Design a protein around this nucleic acid. Structure first.
Ligand SMILES: [Zn+2]
Ligand SMILES: [Zn+2]
Ligand SMILES: [Zn+2]
Length: 82
DNA sequence: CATAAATCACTGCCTA
DNA sequence: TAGGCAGTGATTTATG
């Protein structure tokens, strides 16, 4: 596995370490197009741009609510589940 | 404990 | 053992 030589954590994928090394190098080449925030992962920014635009492609067919992130849908569905 | 938004970290595909 | 790209999930922060 790839272990970070800064804080001291491991990554099964060199890429997970890459983004992680980016946490130390603070590399955020994905700048919000509106409130200028900065992210280090396109889709995470795109999910940001959507919190603007108002896009929520994850529709819960349980209580008619919609979400930008699936994780937020998954957890949201987890509440419906039990 | 729950919501809306934030940030991190795992995943599938490819080569010397 | 090393490095990128695109898709997805689990986690935590800030607030009520
Ligand atoms: Zn580290
Ligand atoms: Zn923004
Ligand atoms: Zn719902």
């Amino acid at each position: 596995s790839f272990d970070c030589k800064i804080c001291g954590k491991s990554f099964k994928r060199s890429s997970t370490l890459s983004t992680h090394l980016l946490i130390h190098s603070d590399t955020r080449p994905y700048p919000c197009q509106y409130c200028g925030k900065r992210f280090h992962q396109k889709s995470d920014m795109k999910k940001h741009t959507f919190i603007h635009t108002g896009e929520k492609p994850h529709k819960c067919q349980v209580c008619g609510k919609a979400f930008s992130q699936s994780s937020n849908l998954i957890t949201h569905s987890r509440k419906h589940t039990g």
